[PDB]
Design a protein around this ligand. Structure first.
Ligand SMILES: *[C@@H]1O[C@H](CO)[C@@H](O[C@@H]2O[C@H](CO)[C@@H](O[C@@H]3O[C@H](CO[C@H]4O[C@H](CO)[C@@H](O)[C@H](O[C@H]5O[C@H](CO)[C@@H](O)[C@H](O)[C@@H]5O)[C@@H]4O)[C@@H](O)[C@H](O[C@H]4O[C@H](CO)[C@@H](O)[C@H](O)[C@@H]4O[C@H]4O[C@H](CO)[C@@H](O)[C@H](O)[C@@H]4O)[C@@H]3O)[C@H](O)[C@H]2NC(C)=O)[C@H](O)[C@H]1NC(C)=O
Ligand SMILES: *[C@@H]1O[C@H](CO)[C@@H](O[C@@H]2O[C@H](CO)[C@@H](O[C@@H]3O[C@H](CO[C@H]4O[C@H](CO)[C@@H](O)[C@H](O)[C@@H]4O)[C@@H](O)[C@H](O[C@H]4O[C@H](CO)[C@@H](O)[C@H](O)[C@@H]4O)[C@@H]3O)[C@H](O)[C@H]2NC(C)=O)[C@H](O)[C@H]1NC(C)=O
Ligand SMILES: *[C@@H]1O[C@H](CO)[C@@H](O[C@@H]2O[C@H](CO)[C@@H](O[C@@H]3O[C@H](CO)[C@@H](O)[C@H](O[C@H]4O[C@H](CO)[C@@H](O)[C@H](O)[C@@H]4O)[C@@H]3O)[C@H](O)[C@H]2NC(C)=O)[C@H](O)[C@H]1NC(C)=O
Ligand SMILES: *[C@@H]1O[C@H](CO)[C@@H](O[C@@H]2O[C@H](CO)[C@@H](O[C@@H]3O[C@H](CO)[C@@H](O)[C@H](O)[C@@H]3O)[C@H](O)[C@H]2NC(C)=O)[C@H](O)[C@H]1NC(C)=O
Ligand SMILES: *[C@@H]1O[C@H](CO)[C@@H](O[C@@H]2O[C@H](CO)[C@@H](O[C@@H]3O[C@H](CO)[C@@H](O)[C@H](O)[C@@H]3O)[C@H](O)[C@H]2NC(C)=O)[C@H](O)[C@H]1NC(C)=O
Ligand SMILES: *[C@@H]1O[C@H](CO)[C@@H](O[C@@H]2O[C@H](CO)[C@@H](O)[C@H](O)[C@H]2NC(C)=O)[C@H](O)[C@H]1NC(C)=O
Ligand SMILES: *[C@@H]1O[C@H](CO)[C@@H](O[C@@H]2O[C@H](CO)[C@@H](O)[C@H](O)[C@H]2NC(C)=O)[C@H](O)[C@H]1NC(C)=O
Ligand SMILES: *[C@@H]1O[C@H](CO)[C@@H](O[C@@H]2O[C@H](CO)[C@@H](O)[C@H](O)[C@H]2NC(C)=O)[C@H](O)[C@H]1NC(C)=O
Ligand SMILES: *OC[C@H]1O[C@@H](*)[C@H](NC(C)=O)[C@@H](O)[C@@H]1O
Ligand SMILES: *[C@@H]1O[C@H](CO)[C@@H](O)[C@H](O)[C@H]1NC(C)=O
Ligand SMILES: *[C@@H]1O[C@H](CO)[C@@H](O)[C@H](O)[C@H]1NC(C)=O
Ligand SMILES: *[C@@H]1O[C@H](CO)[C@@H](O)[C@H](O)[C@H]1NC(C)=O
Ligand SMILES: *[C@@H]1O[C@H](CO)[C@@H](O)[C@H](O)[C@H]1NC(C)=O
Ligand SMILES: *[C@@H]1O[C@H](CO)[C@@H](O)[C@H](O)[C@H]1NC(C)=O
Ligand SMILES: *[C@@H]1O[C@H](CO)[C@@H](O)[C@H](O)[C@H]1NC(C)=O
Ligand SMILES: *[C@@H]1O[C@H](CO)[C@@H](O)[C@H](O)[C@H]1NC(C)=O
Ligand SMILES: *[C@@H]1O[C@H](CO)[C@@H](O)[C@H](O)[C@H]1NC(C)=O
Ligand SMILES: *[C@@H]1O[C@H](CO)[C@@H](O)[C@H](O)[C@H]1NC(C)=O
Ligand SMILES: *[C@@H]1O[C@H](CO)[C@@H](O)[C@H](O)[C@H]1NC(C)=O
Ligand SMILES: *[C@@H]1O[C@H](CO)[C@@H](O)[C@H](O)[C@H]1NC(C)=O
Ligand SMILES: *[C@@H]1O[C@H](CO)[C@@H](O)[C@H](O)[C@H]1NC(C)=O
Lengths: 240, 211, 137, 226, 213, 446
């Protein structure tokens, strides 16, 4: 009944180092092992190691025994049975095949034959290893298009282009518009640039009472784009 | 008026207590005053001795103990006969304008000395001034007792005699003066006059005559 | 099974199973707490003696519950009352190897009085009926 | 420092006493100075003192009849006492005053006090309160055996307090005795001063007695001869 | 990975399916516990099975585990649309970390068909102003896990600048995909129309845009 | 798969509650001093070995401001004061008119005694200025300040006012949770928890403003408060390094025993032998300035980086503005100007000496009623105490807000002195009954 929030996605050149954090809440951080597991396209899911916040004893897989350093802070108590903590994993000598998604995971039981078993997982941290630099994205409006003339529904959105750092988030009306949102995965161009599209389906009659603003974020390039989608469509089926 | 007297044997240690007892932490001066001279500061700060004052004198320190201010004279001499004032200062009495009542120190047991007697007849100028006074000077006698008698020839003169009371001099010996005032016809009336002095020692006399 | 003794309340932070075996530690000090000699009561023993009686009144209150539950002489005893899933929906390994007795009491706190009613009625009040019938003949 | 007093020798009742004190060997500006007297049959009475700031403080027993002043241009201390009576007849000493501090605690709490101690004194000066006038002394020679003879001067009938007697200044200092005075029933005073002289020194040496009677206007020398 | 699972397995709606998990005796299960995880791509996994048969808290009784001396098995009964995903097994002890398997993708047969939704977007005027042109063919709501996309310039195929993504699963257990056609402004203006053709084994849909309007 | 409930007796489960604790202290014989009220005749024999048990993995919430041990200790010190004043002599006949003169606040006062022991007795004793007030105001007559408010009773001469260590214990079935966190805030969850049967040796040092002879906070000093933004609540501070304060009554006073009648004996202040020196307290300015600098470092931790001024007390009566305390038997009232006269911004020794007056009649804990006459202490007085804490108070309404902040000393309540040493202890009731389901069933009856 607790939440584990990991640090944001990062981009580090090969040969450099990176330290990922994992802040915990909703449970006694001292009572459960913190596991670190990664997933790459070349080797699939691979368990890296775990560390005990209570005793400090760490167990690393031999593949990560010489390049991973795990540390934990002291639990900041909240109530008698809950607290807040943080666990850190510092990985060095990064290579291209290390690009992937990393996860911190809470143990299963305090005692028994399977105490460290990863039970509660974080949302994941995306790590990109490449010699290329950070490129800011470009946002274009996707004009409204008809979805059902008899149903009176339309679809509008925003198109994102030319960005190298894969982590990109899109919201609508500062998070006030969540229904009908559909975000599509990104495309991998031959140049090494990633681009995606996002679209939302709304009634065609909603033109004079609702404002539609797409908010594009990009933590690596540290660029925010607030684009106003022009509701005037050019589709003949929607013009009717 | 009565002040205070003290008697001490020659050569021993005299202790003069202060007439006042301090109510608080004290500052006491001890002064020595001889007749006809300037007073001397013997002790200041209850325990400090000015330069030139012999170490035979000493005061009592204010160590917060219950001790009265005391002046100690070790090996007293006849030259220590004087009056000793205890000027007392303390924190509870205020500005002490009073020097207090000193205690006269009398040093006893010094050798008895024989008195010297000198008898002068009336001057020729005094006779031609229609007066006449016979002067009998007694000096250099250490014991205290005295008595001077005058005799016109063989009969004792009873009036016209004015004798000083004896007092010690700069040699610590006593001295007295006796004056018998006569008229020029009384002086030339008798064949002789005589000053006979009495001193717990023995009969002593001298004699003059008109010539 | 644990043979290490930690003292009174030493197994509060441990799991319920690791603490269910050391119940003799919290049972000896629960009752014994006596100021043996040297006491004068002057706005003290009135408060002190009542605190000592309130301890044995709640102690005998707990033994009264264990008396009507058929567990007067045992710390560990099993019953006939089935476990209602509405009380807690956790399995066996989730309770005795993950939670503590402190946080467990907070979860079942809402139904403690309900279970106490069924514990003195569903079994002991009804098992004594068949106990009279088994030794009847 | 050296102190020497000078006075009138005689004051009449209901008049103003005045004495002066010359200082030597030390500057008058950097010290406290005070006056003390002693009357016959009484003890030393502290009159008052002047500070280096030329501020004065007096014994209340004097009833504001006293006033003390400084004169740095002549390095002299001065004292006046108005409206005198016979009780004011005394020998008046001038003295230096040093201020000490006896502290028994915290200075800010007033747990201290001051005290004065006189360290240098003067021989004093005789001052009499009497209605009559100063009478000069008529002095006579007492003409002069164990190798020595007696040689005297009779100082007869002088009115107030002391008389200074010297003998050839410094030459005759070895064996001179000036006797204490006698009080005649007339109120007049008389003393005698004698010297012991070798009989061989008679007829060849000379001896005069210098009789100073400062209260009266007087000055006499007397050559004594057999 | 030395822990091998069945590469693929299929079951019908409302039926049961079994996934295998075996390997050498160095990783075998006689002396090691076996756990099972449901791991949807791009999302955090969820533990369903641990210590062989014992299931995780809150797991439905439809899931069961069984471990022989040469292999372990995971049985999923009463298959649902959400059960159609990737599954992994792991061998572990108490002091040694997890060793993941090769993975198994489960397909649920007997599901209803879901018509595809195609939408084609032309390049924006701001993009033509920037001297590029990209046609965006968005496609959603798919019954099968596969599509085939073709582009046409004036009813004739295109082969330069075509980039198509892999199919992705929607939150409603449907599928989705997208395709992009990069073009120069000359090719965009020199043709009467462009077309995106989405071909499925049951029906082929065609959407057409025109640079004239 | 069949789960049956199972009873467990002795489960580590506790709940907050308030109960009635008891005294604990070492058994010092003290044959020369007949049973001082804090050592008592016989309160307990303290356990030879103090026993504490760390409760690992246990977090618990503490609140020193809603604690019941403070309200208990406050009611116990008040009741112990009344039980110690009943058998002692009451000063009902002394209120006879007093003819007073100065010895300077200290004054001599003649009076005529009404005895029963031959009809009357003239006597005059040394009384301070605070104890008396004139009626004719022509200095002809005086009276005790208390003779128009309430009764007065002289404290017994055998009992001593020295605070000794007192341990507060919980009865059977109860436990005391001790927080051991170093940087422990006043209220909140404490990670390190250990249980004890009795608290540490707490000395009941009744003090105003600065806290004396207390416990020092470990590592960094601590700023504790119920509300820091709301001024109306006091501010308790606990230093790490204790400053030394040396107070003295240099007056070599003397005691004069006066018989009222059958058995009744009054102890009057005789004439003082020696000099009159008012009471004072040296506090080292260097280690006070160092301590003052460590306090402002942490006060600013809740008031931006730099905004603070130190002034003196300006509200209440004389018994609240002054540092009131006990030493040697006499109660001192010290002026605290020089300690709280500073200004800090932007983040030689001269031992500071405070003037202290003396009062022999007192009304502590805001007690309006039965009043105590402190008998005079013979001989000079000198005590050295370790000032360990302070009690401050904001001024409040400020237009500049962060522009300047001002902290004045105050002592609105005595319970703050118990809160400065009871912040770490808490009372709980052990509930040993726990029911949990297992796969075990009792032997079937059928
Ligand atoms: C809080 O702190 C403050 C300071 O921070 C403390 O204050 C102290 O309080 C005590 C007790 O009241 C004081 O003691 C008294 O000191 C008097 C001063 O004399 C000697 O001390 C000073 C240092 O304070 C030295 O400088 C002196 O020597 C120098 O000065 C003289 C004068 O210029 C020179 O001539 C010398 O050559 C030096 O250059 C002195 O040594 C002192 O008079 C006083 O009275 C007597 O007490 C004792 C015990 O009997 C004697 O030893 C002492 O000598 C005094 O005795 C009398 O006789 C001597 C000669 O023998 C004469 O000097 C006097 O007539 C004297 O009356 C007492 O000792 C202390 O001075 C003071 N310190 C400071 C720095 O202010 C507080 O105590 C403290 N609070 C507490 C609770 O402790
Ligand atoms: C206070 O709070 C924390 C909870 O956060 C508890 O810490 C847990 O303590 C339990 C009990 O000791 C631990 O569970 C144990 O796991 C061990 C696995 O660790 C192995 O590998 C590590 C490397 O990280 C080594 O340090 C360790 O020595 C082991 O080699 C098991 O060894 C334990 O028992 C296992 O083996 C025995 C036989 O040997 C079997 O009977 C068991 O069934 C089991 O297979 C045990 O399972 C848990 O890992 C700890 N977690 C953390 C995060 O530290 C404290 O216990 C708790 N209370 C107290 C009093 O401290
Ligand atoms: C604690 O110590 C302080 C520090 O000394 C002490 O404060 C002092 O109080 C007295 C009493 O008022 C002050 O004396 C004043 O002096 C000024 C001139 O310097 C006078 O003008 C004052 O008279 C006026 O004010 C009086 C009070 O308002 C009126 O009654 C009067 O009619 C005049 O209007 C007064 O005499 C002294 O100045 C201060 N100290 C300092 C350094 O200023 C204080 O009393 C001690 N006790 C406490 C605070 O309980
Ligand atoms: C109560 O009234 C009586 C009335 O006599 C007071 O007694 C008198 O006290 C004084 C001193 O204050 C005595 O005077 C002197 O005492 C000293 C002490 O040493 C002594 O040395 C003197 O010779 C002189 O006696 C006086 O004698 C004494 N009365 C009698 C009859 O002896 C008493 O002090 C008063 N008490 C109070 C507290 O007011
Ligand atoms: C301020 O607080 C500090 C912190 O304790 C005090 O330091 C200690 O002061 C005492 C007294 O000066 C020192 O004792 C002395 O020790 C030396 C030898 O070291 C000895 O020769 C002396 O006779 C005396 O006993 C002590 O060592 C010292 N401690 C440290 C660690 O420095 C300081 O005194 C306080 N000062 C003031 C003005 O408050
Ligand atoms: C305080 O006062 C007492 C009372 O006088 C002092 O004690 C006596 O002091 C004297 C001084 O010589 C001794 O002879 C006595 O033996 C002391 N005791 C008695 C019972 O008389 C004491 O010294 C004073 N001292 C201080 C520091 O206050
Ligand atoms: C015991 O059950 C009651 C009833 O549901 C709980 O009280 C409600 O708790 C919810 C949140 O859990 C609140 O939103 C409601 O306002 C509460 N009251 C009502 C009337 O619904 C209570 O929290 C439960 N206690 C425990 C310890 O589980
Ligand atoms: C209060 O006490 C004083 C002192 O005994 C009484 O009057 C004093 O009488 C003495 C007698 O020598 C005088 O020296 C004092 O000056 C007097 N006092 C004053 C203030 O002048 C006085 O009569 C007493 N009064 C009462 C009402 O008891
Ligand atoms: O934080 C305030 C102050 O507290 C005391 C500490 N000293 C020690 C020895 O712990 C100071 O360093 C600190 O500044
Ligand atoms: C007691 O009464 C008498 C009678 O008037 C009075 O003179 C005296 O001052 C009073 N006080 C004392 C202490 O004697
Ligand atoms: C008692 O005296 C005090 C002294 O100020 C006064 O305030 C009070 O009003 C008096 N008592 C009554 C009942 O008024
Ligand atoms: C926590 O507890 C341990 C042992 O009980 C003790 O050594 C340590 O000092 C404590 N630390 C804190 C911050 O309470
Ligand atoms: C410490 O406690 C006070 C009072 O509850 C609170 O206002 C303050 O925020 C706490 N400290 C911190 C760092 O939050
Ligand atoms: C202090 O009081 C203010 C005003 O009522 C309030 O807003 C604040 O929350 C309080 N803070 C604490 C710690 O009590
Ligand atoms: C407080 O400190 C911070 C960090 O050094 C600084 O940014 C800020 O400007 C400071 N504020 C003031 C008022 O000094
Ligand atoms: C504060 O102390 C200084 C000396 O450090 C002093 O001059 C000033 O008057 C004091 N101020 C107050 C209000 O006491
Ligand atoms: C800080 O205080 C000092 C000391 O008086 C003063 O000179 C300075 O101007 C003050 N600075 C500020 C910014 O208040
Ligand atoms: C008081 O301070 C002194 C001096 O540092 C120290 O020796 C003593 O242990 C301290 N006592 C207390 C109770 O703080
Ligand atoms: C507070 O400040 C404002 C201007 O900032 C001023 O008008 C007002 O009078 C001030 N109030 C007080 C009580 O000083
Ligand atoms: C309080 O903050 C204001 C900003 O509004 C600043 O100007 C002022 O300097 C601050 N006060 C300080 C630092 O004392
Ligand atoms: C300090 O005292 C002065 C004078 O009493 C007063 O005007 C000022 O407001 C005070 N400052 C504080 C912060 O208390």
């Amino acid at each position: 009944e607790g939440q584990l929030v990991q640090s944001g996605a990062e981009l580090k050149k090969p040969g450099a180092s990176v330290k990922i954090s994992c802040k915990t809440s909703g449970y006694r951080f001292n009572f459960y092992h913190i596991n670190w597991i990664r997933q790459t396209a070349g080797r699939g899911p691979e368990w890296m190691g775990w560390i005990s916040p209570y005793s400090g004893d760490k167990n690393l897989a031999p593949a990560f025994q010489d390049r991973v350093i795990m540390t934990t802070d002291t639990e900041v108590p909240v109530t008698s049975f809950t607290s807040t903590g943080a666990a850190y994993m510092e990985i060095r000598n990064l290579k291209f095949d290390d690009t992937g998604t990393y996860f911190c995971a809470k143990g299963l039981l305090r005692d028994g034959s399977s105490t460290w078993l990863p039970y509660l997982w974080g949302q994941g941290t995306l790590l990109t290893v490449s010699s290329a630099s950070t490129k800011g994205p470009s946002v274009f409006p996707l004009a409204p298009s008809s979805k059902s003339t008899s149903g009176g529904t339309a679809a509008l959105g925003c198109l994102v282009k030319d960005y190298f750092p894969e982590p990109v988030t899109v919201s609508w009306n500062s998070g006030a518009l969540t229904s009908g949102v559909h975000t599509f995965p990104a495309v991998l161009q031959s140049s090494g640039l990633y681009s995606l599209s996002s679209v939302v389906t709304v009634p065609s009659s909603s033109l004079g009472t609702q404002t539609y603003i797409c908010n594009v974020n990009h933590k690596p390039s540290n660029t925010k784009v607030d684009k106003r989608v022009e509701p005037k469509s050019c589709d003949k089926g929607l013009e009717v | 008026s009565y002040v205070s007297p003290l008697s001490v044997a020659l050569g021993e240690t005299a202790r003069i207590s202060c007439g006042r007892q301090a109510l608080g932490s004290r500052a006491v001066q001890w002064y020595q005053h001889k007749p006809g001279q300037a007073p001397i500061l013997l002790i200041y700060n209850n325990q400090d001795r000015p330069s030139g004052i012999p170490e035979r004198f000493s005061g009592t320190p204010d160590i917060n103990f219950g001790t009265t201010a005391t002046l100690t004279i070790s090996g007293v001499e006849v030259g220590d006969e004087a009056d000793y004032y205890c000027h007392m200062w303390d924190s509870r009495s205020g500005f002490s304008w009073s020097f207090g009542g000193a205690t006269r120190l009398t040093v006893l047991s010094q050798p008895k000395a024989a008195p010297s007697v000198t008898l002068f007849p009336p001057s020729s100028e005094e006779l031609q001034a229609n007066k006449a006074t016979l002067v009998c000077l007694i000096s250099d006698f250490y014991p205290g007792a005295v008595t001077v008698a005058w005799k016109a020839d063989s009969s004792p003169v009873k009036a016209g005699v004015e004798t000083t009371t004896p007092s010690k001099q700069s040699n610590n010996k006593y001295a007295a003066s006796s004056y018998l005032s006569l008229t020029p016809e009384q002086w030339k009336s008798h064949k002789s006059y005589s000053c006979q002095v009495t001193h717990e020692g023995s009969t002593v006399e001298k004699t003059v005559a008109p010539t | 099974i644990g043979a290490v003794f930690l003292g009174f309340l030493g197994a509060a932070g441990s799991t319920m199973g690791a603490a269910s075996m050391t119940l003799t530690v919290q049972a000896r000090n629960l009752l014994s707490g006596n100021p043996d000699w040297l006491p004068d009561m002057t706005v003290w023993g009135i408060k002190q003696l009542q605190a000592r009686v309130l301890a044995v009144e709640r102690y005998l209150r707990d033994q009264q519950l264990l008396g009507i539950w058929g567990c007067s002489g045992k710390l560990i005893c099993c019953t006939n009352v089935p476990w209602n899933s509405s009380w807690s929906n956790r399995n066996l390994s989730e309770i005795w190897d993950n939670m503590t007795w402190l946080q467990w009491d907070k979860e079942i706190s809402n139904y403690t009085q309900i279970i106490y009613g069924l514990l003195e009625e569903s079994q002991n009040q009804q098992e004594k009926n068949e106990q009279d019938l088994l030794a009847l003949d | 420092v050296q102190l020497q007093e000078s006075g009138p020798g005689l004051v009449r009742p209901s008049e103003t006493l005045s004495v002066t004190c010359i200082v030597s060997g030390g500057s008058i500006s950097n010290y406290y100075w005070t006056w003390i007297r002693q009357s016959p049959g009484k003890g030393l009475e502290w009159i008052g003192y002047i500070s280096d700031r030329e501020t004065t403080t007096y014994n209340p027993s004097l009833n504001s009849r006293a006033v003390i002043s400084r004169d740095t241009s002549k390095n002299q201390l001065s004292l006046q006492l108005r409206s005198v009576t016979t009780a004011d007849t005394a020998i008046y000493f001038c003295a230096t005053a040093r201020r000490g501090q006896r502290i028994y605690g915290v200075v800010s709490f007033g747990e201290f006090f001051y005290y004065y101690y006189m360290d240098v004194w003067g021989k004093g000066t005789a001052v009499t309160v009497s209605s009559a006038s100063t009478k000069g002394p008529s002095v006579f020679p007492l003409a002069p055996s164990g190798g020595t003879a007696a040689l005297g001067c009779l100082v007869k009938d002088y009115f107030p307090e002391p008389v200074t007697v010297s003998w050839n200044s410094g030459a005759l200092t070895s064996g001179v005795h000036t006797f204490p005075a006698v009080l005649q029933s007339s109120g007049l005073y008389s003393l005698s001063s004698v010297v012991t002289v070798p009989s061989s020194s008679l007829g060849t040496q000379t001896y005069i007695c210098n009789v100073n009677h400062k209260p009266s206007n007087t000055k006499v020398d007397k050559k004594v001869e057999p | 990975s030395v822990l091998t699972q069945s590469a693929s397995v299929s079951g019908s709606l409302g039926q049961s399916v079994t996934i295998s998990c075996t390997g050498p005796n160095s990783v075998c299960c006689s002396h090691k516990s076996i756990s099972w995880y449901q791991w949807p791509p791009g999302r955090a996994p969820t533990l369903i099975i641990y210590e062989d048969n014992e299931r995780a808290p809150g797991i439905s009784p439809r899931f069961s585990g069984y471990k022989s001396y040469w292999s372990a098995y995971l049985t999923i009964s009463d298959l649902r649309p959400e059960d159609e995903t990737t599954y992994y097994c792991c061998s572990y002890t108490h002091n040694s970390g997890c060793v993941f398997g090769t993975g198994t993708k489960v397909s649920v047969l007997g599901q209803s068909k879901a018509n595809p939704s195609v939408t084609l977007f032309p390049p924006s005027s701001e993009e033509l102003q920037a001297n590029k042109a990209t046609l965006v063919c968005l496609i959603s709501d798919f019954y099968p896990g596969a599509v085939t996309v073709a582009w046409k310039a004036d009813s004739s195929p295109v082969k330069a600048g075509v980039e198509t993504t892999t199919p992705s699963k929607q939150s409603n257990n449907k599928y989705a995909a997208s395709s992009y056609l990069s073009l120069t402004p000359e090719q965009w203006k020199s043709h009467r129309s462009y077309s995106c053709q989405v071909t499925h084994e049951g029906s082929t849909v065609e959407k057409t845009v025109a640079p004239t309007e | 798969e069949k789960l049956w409930v199972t009873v467990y007796y002795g489960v580590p489960v506790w709940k907050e509650a308030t109960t009635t604790l008891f005294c604990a202290s070492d058994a010092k014989a003290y044959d020369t001093e007949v049973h001082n009220v804090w050592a008592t005749h016989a309160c307990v024999p303290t356990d030879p070995n103090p026993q504490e048990v760390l409760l690992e993995n246990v977090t618990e919430e503490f609140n020193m401001w809603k604690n019941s041990m403070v309200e208990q200790m406050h009611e116990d010190i008040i009741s112990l004061w009344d039980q110690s004043l009943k058998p002692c002599v009451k000063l009902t006949p002394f209120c006879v008119t007093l003819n007073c003169t100065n010895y300077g606040d200290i004054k001599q006062c003649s009076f005529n005694i009404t005895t029963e022991i031959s009809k009357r007795r003239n006597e005059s004793a040394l009384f301070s200025k605070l104890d008396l007030e004139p009626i004719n105001n022509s200095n002809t007559s005086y009276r005790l300040i208390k003779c128009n408010t309430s009764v007065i009773k002289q404290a017994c001469p055998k009992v001593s006012f020295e605070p000794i260590p007192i341990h507060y214990c919980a009865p059977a079935g109860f436990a005391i949770l001790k927080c051991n966190d170093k940087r422990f805030n006043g209220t909140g969850p404490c990670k390190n928890v250990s249980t004890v049967q009795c608290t540490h040796g707490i000395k009941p040092v009744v003090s105003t403003q600065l806290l004396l002879n207390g416990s020092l906070a470990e590592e960094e000093v601590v700023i504790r408060s119920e509300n820091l933004t709301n001024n109306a609540k006091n501010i308790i501070i606990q230093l790490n390094e204790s400053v030394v304060i040396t107070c003295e009554r240099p007056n070599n006073n003397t005691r004069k025993r006066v018989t009222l009648g059958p058995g009744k004996v009054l102890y009057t202040t005789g004439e003082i032998i020696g000099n009159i020196r008012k009471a004072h307290c040296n506090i080292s300015k260097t280690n006070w300035t160092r301590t003052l600098e460590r306090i402002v470092i942490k006060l600013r931790e809740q008031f931006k980086n730099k905004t603070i001024v130190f002034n003196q007390s300006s509200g209440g009566d004389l018994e609240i503005v002054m540092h009131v305390f006990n030493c040697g038997g006499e109660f001192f009232y010290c002026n605290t100007t020089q300690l709280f006269n500073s200004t800090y911004n932007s983040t030689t020794d001269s031992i500071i000496t405070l003037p202290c007056r003396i009062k022999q009649i007192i009304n502590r804990w805001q007690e309006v009623g039965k009043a105590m006459y402190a008998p005079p202490i013979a001989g000079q007085i000198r005590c050295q105490s370790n000032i360990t804490g302070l009690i401050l108070t904001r001024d409040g309404g400020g237009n500049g807000t962060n522009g300047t902040e001002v902290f004045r000393p105050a002592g609105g309540d005595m319970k703050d002195n118990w809160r400065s040493e009871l912040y770490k202890y808490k009372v709980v009731r052990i509930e040993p009954l726990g029911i949990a389901p297992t796969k075990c069933k009792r032997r079937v009856v059928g």
